[PDB]
Enzyme design. Structure first.
Site, PDB file in Angstrom:
ATOM      1  N   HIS A  68     -69.633 -34.293  19.250  1.00 14.07           N
ATOM      2  CA  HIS A  68     -69.360 -35.656  20.249  1.00 14.07           C
ATOM      3  C   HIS A  68     -68.148 -36.552  20.527  1.00 14.07           C
ATOM      4  O   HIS A  68     -68.587 -37.627  20.586  1.00 14.07           O
ATOM      5  CB  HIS A  68     -70.930 -36.138  20.302  1.00 14.07           C
ATOM      6  CG  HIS A  68     -71.878 -34.796  20.532  1.00 14.07           C
ATOM      7  ND1 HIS A  68     -72.745 -34.535  19.586  1.00 14.07           N
ATOM      8  CD2 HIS A  68     -72.744 -34.947  21.449  1.00 14.07           C
ATOM      9  CE1 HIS A  68     -73.253 -33.773  19.731  1.00 14.07           C
ATOM     10  NE2 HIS A  68     -73.228 -33.980  21.143  1.00 14.07           N
ATOM     11  N   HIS A 106     -70.634 -36.783  30.618  1.00  9.62           N
ATOM     12  CA  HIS A 106     -71.960 -36.679  29.934  1.00  9.62           C
ATOM     13  C   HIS A 106     -72.271 -37.286  28.762  1.00  9.62           C
ATOM     14  O   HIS A 106     -74.061 -37.135  27.878  1.00  9.62           O
ATOM     15  CB  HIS A 106     -72.196 -35.290  30.001  1.00  9.62           C
ATOM     16  CG  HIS A 106     -72.680 -34.355  28.998  1.00  9.62           C
ATOM     17  ND1 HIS A 106     -70.670 -34.403  28.917  1.00  9.62           N
ATOM     18  CD2 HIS A 106     -72.655 -33.605  27.821  1.00  9.62           C
ATOM     19  CE1 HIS A 106     -70.717 -33.442  27.775  1.00  9.62           C
ATOM     20  NE2 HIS A 106     -71.979 -33.063  27.206  1.00  9.62           N
TER      21      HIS A 106
END
Ligand code: IIU
Ligand code: MG
Ligand code: ZN
EC number: 3.1.4.17
Length: 313
Positions: A68, A106
């Site tokens: 991530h 995001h």
């Protein structure tokens, strides 16, 4: 003003394809993103100096976690670029502006842990945001960065256009909470099959953008096999660290996050392709026929995980 970004020939051609891999040269990723805004949106969408400053503060607020990270942000933005470029006339000017930014932003400030882990740890974010915990944080970090001096890339929009773009971004970021994907996709299934799907209905457009966000977010399963398989290692590096952290709270993690159960990964990937990925790209393809290559590539990777189980690799 007359200043295009241009890419070497191999990237200029391949960046247009859904399965494009942005490469290991981190310093080329800002330029790849600006290239995609310029072709997706226009050279006029954003002041170059403000856009560059925004991109670099976004990068700084992604962490050095295995999956991530800044590379995931840009990868998810490229999949949105491919969807937008293949569906030229379906999207508004504000949608083109918002959705690439939403994708870049995001997972801002992701720590490598699920919403579940934050709730079991009793992290402060889990008391501030009771559902879609990390995704409300990601939206909060996006607004923070938009408010830094010199970082308002939306400064030329009217008050109400600005409010509309930030609302497109909020919904697009919230939709990347996979817990919300199952219901969103079922409603989109019913709407498409009973013929009630209406792209002039704002609550319908919102649903379709939510599904686009899921499809971009999961796009690692739509790469050529060697990319998909190596990305899987980064995904599991995080899951297994979360598993370890659950064991430290005195909680047996789910098998997906238990490194002692590496042997069950191929069958786990099959479940994910069958329950999440294939349905996602199937419904996307029904709504937006030019996104079919994402579905074709996903099925190719499913069949590669089937080969792994059969010891043919
Ligand atoms: C952050 C979201 C996300 C997840 C994934 C992903 O691979 N998911 C998944 C789902 C479900 N199981 N079950 C397993 C499993 C089950 C039993 C034993 C061992 C493993 N392994 C996964 C893996 C891919 C992408 Cl591109 N994004
Ligand atoms: Mg996320
Ligand atoms: Zn993501």
């Amino acid at each position: 003003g007359l200043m295009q970004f241009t890419l070497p020939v191999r990237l200029c051609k391949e960046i247009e394809l859904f399965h494009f891999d942005i490469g290991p040269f981190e310093n080329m990723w800002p330029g790849i993103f600006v290239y995609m805004v310029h072709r997706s949106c226009g050279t006029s969408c954003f002041e170059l100096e403000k856009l560059c400053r925004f991109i670099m503060s976004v990068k700084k607020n992604y962490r050095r976690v295995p999956y991530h990270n800044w590379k995931h942000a840009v990868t998810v933005a490229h999949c949105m670029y491919a969807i937008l470029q293949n569906n030229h006339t379906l999207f508004t000017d504000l949608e083109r502006k918002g959705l690439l930014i939403a994708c870049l932003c995001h997972d801002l400030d992701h720590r490598g842990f699920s919403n579940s882990y934050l709730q079991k740890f009793d992290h402060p974010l889990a008391a501030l945001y009771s559902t879609s915990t990390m995704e409300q944080h990601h939206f909060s970090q996006t607004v923070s960065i938009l408010q830094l001096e010199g970082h308002n890339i939306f400064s030329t929009l009217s008050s109400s256009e600005y409010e509309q773009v930030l609302e497109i971004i909020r919904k697009a970021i919230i939709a990347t909470d996979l817990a919300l994907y199952f219901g969103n996709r079922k409603q989109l299934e019913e709407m498409y099959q009973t013929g009630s799907l209406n792209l002039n209905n704002q609550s319908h457009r919102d649903r379709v953008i939510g599904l686009m966000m899921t499809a971009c977010d999961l796009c690692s399963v739509t790469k050529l096999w060697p990319v998909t398989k190596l990305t899987a290692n980064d995904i599991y590096a995080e899951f297994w660290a979360e598993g370890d952290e659950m064991k430290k709270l005195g909680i047996q993690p789910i098998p997906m996050m238990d490194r002692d159960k590496k042997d069950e990964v191929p069958q786990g990937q099959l479940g994910f392709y069958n329950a999440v990925a294939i349905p996602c790209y199937t419904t996307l393809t029904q709504i937006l026929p030019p996104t079919e290559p994402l579905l074709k590539a996903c099925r190719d990777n499913l069949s590669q995980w089937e080969k792994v189980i059969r010891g043919e690799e």
